[PDB]
Design an enzyme around this catalytic site. Sequence first.
Site, PDB file in Angstrom:
ATOM      1  N   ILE A  10       0.843  -1.185   0.000  1.00 22.39           N
ATOM      2  CA  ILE A  10       0.000   0.000   0.000  1.00 22.39           C
ATOM      3  C   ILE A  10       0.872   1.227   0.000  1.00 22.39           C
ATOM      4  CG2 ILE A  10      -1.429   1.467   1.436  1.00 22.39           C
ATOM      5  CD1 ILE A  10      -2.712  -1.360   2.398  1.00 22.39           C
ATOM      6  N   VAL A  17       6.664  -0.407   6.274  1.00 18.45           N
ATOM      7  CA  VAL A  17       5.842  -0.610   5.097  1.00 18.45           C
ATOM      8  C   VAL A  17       4.450  -1.073   5.513  1.00 18.45           C
ATOM      9  CG1 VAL A  17       6.615  -3.021   4.815  1.00 18.45           C
ATOM     10  CG2 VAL A  17       5.707  -1.721   2.829  1.00 18.45           C
ATOM     11  N   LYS A  33       0.893  -3.576   9.052  1.00 16.95           N
ATOM     12  CA  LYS A  33       1.938  -2.562   9.190  1.00 16.95           C
ATOM     13  C   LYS A  33       3.164  -3.169   9.846  1.00 16.95           C
ATOM     14  CE  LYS A  33      -0.636   1.661   8.569  1.00 16.95           C
ATOM     15  NZ  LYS A  33      -0.884   3.095   8.927  1.00 16.95           N
ATOM     16  N   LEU A  72      -9.251  -0.409   4.650  1.00 20.94           N
ATOM     17  CA  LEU A  72     -10.137   0.471   3.913  1.00 20.94           C
ATOM     18  C   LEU A  72      -9.445   0.754   2.582  1.00 20.94           C
ATOM     19  CD1 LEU A  72     -10.683   1.225   7.042  1.00 20.94           C
ATOM     20  CD2 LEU A  72     -12.263   2.902   6.000  1.00 20.94           C
ATOM     21  N   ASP A  75      -7.388   6.505   0.916  1.00 17.29           N
ATOM     22  CA  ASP A  75      -7.113   7.536   1.905  1.00 17.29           C
ATOM     23  C   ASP A  75      -7.565   8.904   1.421  1.00 17.29           C
ATOM     24  OD1 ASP A  75      -4.838   9.091   0.763  1.00 17.29           O
ATOM     25  OD2 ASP A  75      -3.748   7.209   0.952  1.00 17.29           O
ATOM     26  N   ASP A 116      -0.451  13.065  15.119  1.00 16.35           N
ATOM     27  CA  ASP A 116       0.074  13.204  13.759  1.00 16.35           C
ATOM     28  C   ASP A 116      -1.013  13.030  12.693  1.00 16.35           C
ATOM     29  OD1 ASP A 116       2.036  13.745  11.788  1.00 16.35           O
ATOM     30  OD2 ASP A 116       2.532  11.595  11.599  1.00 16.35           O
ATOM     31  N   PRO A 119      -3.898  13.933   5.948  1.00 18.59           N
ATOM     32  CA  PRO A 119      -4.794  13.256   5.019  1.00 18.59           C
ATOM     33  C   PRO A 119      -4.462  11.799   4.757  1.00 18.59           C
ATOM     34  CG  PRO A 119      -4.440  15.518   4.279  1.00 18.59           C
ATOM     35  CD  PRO A 119      -3.535  15.304   5.482  1.00 18.59           C
ATOM     36  N   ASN A 121      -3.535   9.644   6.808  1.00 19.99           N
ATOM     37  CA  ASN A 121      -4.056   8.725   7.820  1.00 19.99           C
ATOM     38  C   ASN A 121      -5.525   8.838   8.081  1.00 19.99           C
ATOM     39  OD1 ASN A 121      -3.708  10.760   9.690  1.00 19.99           O
ATOM     40  ND2 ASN A 121      -1.666   9.936  10.247  1.00 19.99           N
TER      41      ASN A 121
HETATM   42  F1  SC9 Z   1      -6.254   0.068   5.320  1.00 18.78           F
HETATM   43  C1  SC9 Z   1      -5.356   0.717   6.031  1.00 18.78           C
HETATM   44  C2  SC9 Z   1      -5.321   0.437   7.398  1.00 18.78           C
HETATM   45  C3  SC9 Z   1      -4.406   1.082   8.239  1.00 18.78           C
HETATM   46  C4  SC9 Z   1      -3.488   1.983   7.690  1.00 18.78           C
HETATM   47  C5  SC9 Z   1      -3.517   2.276   6.315  1.00 18.78           C
HETATM   48  C6  SC9 Z   1      -4.426   1.647   5.448  1.00 18.78           C
HETATM   49  C7  SC9 Z   1      -4.441   2.086   4.016  1.00 18.78           C
HETATM   50  C8  SC9 Z   1      -5.118   1.424   2.996  1.00 18.78           C
HETATM   51  N1  SC9 Z   1      -5.187   1.974   1.760  1.00 18.78           N
HETATM   52  C9  SC9 Z   1      -5.779   1.528   0.596  1.00 18.78           C
HETATM   53  C10 SC9 Z   1      -5.433   2.461  -0.356  1.00 18.78           C
HETATM   54  N2  SC9 Z   1      -4.652   3.436   0.169  1.00 18.78           N
HETATM   55  C11 SC9 Z   1      -4.530   3.116   1.473  1.00 18.78           C
HETATM   56  C12 SC9 Z   1      -3.799   3.793   2.532  1.00 18.78           C
HETATM   57  N3  SC9 Z   1      -3.165   4.956   2.198  1.00 18.78           N
HETATM   58  C13 SC9 Z   1      -2.565   5.698   3.312  1.00 18.78           C
HETATM   59  C14 SC9 Z   1      -1.130   5.299   3.456  1.00 18.78           C
HETATM   60  C15 SC9 Z   1      -0.190   5.585   2.449  1.00 18.78           C
HETATM   61  C16 SC9 Z   1       1.142   5.178   2.629  1.00 18.78           C
HETATM   62  C17 SC9 Z   1       1.476   4.487   3.800  1.00 18.78           C
HETATM   63  N4  SC9 Z   1       0.589   4.217   4.787  1.00 18.78           N
HETATM   64  C18 SC9 Z   1      -0.674   4.618   4.595  1.00 18.78           C
HETATM   65  N5  SC9 Z   1      -3.782   3.267   3.741  1.00 18.78           N
END
Ligand code: SC9
Length: 287
Positions: A10, A17, A33, A72, A75, A116, A119, A121
Amino acid sequence: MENFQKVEKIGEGTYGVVYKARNKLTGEVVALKKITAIREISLLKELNHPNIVKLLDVIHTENKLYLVFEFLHQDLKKFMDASALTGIPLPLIKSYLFQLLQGLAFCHSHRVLHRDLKPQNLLINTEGAIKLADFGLARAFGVPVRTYTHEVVTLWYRAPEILLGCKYYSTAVDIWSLGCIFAEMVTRRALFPGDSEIDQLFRIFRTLGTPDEVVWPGVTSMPDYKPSFPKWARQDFSKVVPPLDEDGRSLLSQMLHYDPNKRISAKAALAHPFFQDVTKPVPHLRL
Ligand SMILES: Fc1ccccc1-c1cn2ccnc2c(NCc2cccnc2)n1
């Protein structure tokens, strides 16, 4: 980890990562994560609310830490970039702000801060919900200047008390960050896109006026306050977030009060007149 199959990367988060993964068992699709800390994180497992991305599990093995979250599909940063041409409709912005305030009110009632907000998060689904991700990780692991990948941790949403060196900032820091995000959804441009700590502070000062003892009792004593800061006059919000209406500008102004003790709480914000006609529209998501 042998219980999860990685589907796709992601992105690179603050601490490690993040992958979309499938539980080889339940077949459940999750976000994985890859990261005192253990105790703090473990507590987050019970801090459940519809507007807070669920922390399903914590896996600690071989001295490596993995956090398993509810997944989800998009973002808010991506949604905003995608909505650039026409902007996010006001009723959706209002619904998102209202839901995020509910999430904050909940966490804040348990004395848990995010610290923190940004957008990247804030996660959204096709149902029109928006949720806060990484709640509590800053206290558990801290907030670095750069990510594990060396990417710069954005300063754009940082409250002025943090920038001025307050050691014991409050839940008000999250209200500031959310106000910055609210303004950014409305105008389609970041409110204070600082590229260093002093640029971030001076961008805040140029719009809201250089803080003084009048608007923020005690500011001049803060650790990183310097009497040599330039003295800029405050701008009208009518110039800052057009074409937001008076109710929205009034709320924004309260979320961006300099004095954290006087900045509006999430609970009080939920009662603001701006939310009189709040609804829950469905966003158009192309997954
Ligand atoms: F589904 C989730 C659960 C918990 C944290 C992030 C996501 C999660 C899922 N996602 C699906 C499409 N984009 C994301 C996304 N983008 C934010 C991001 C970008 C780079 C690094 N980390 C987060 N985060």
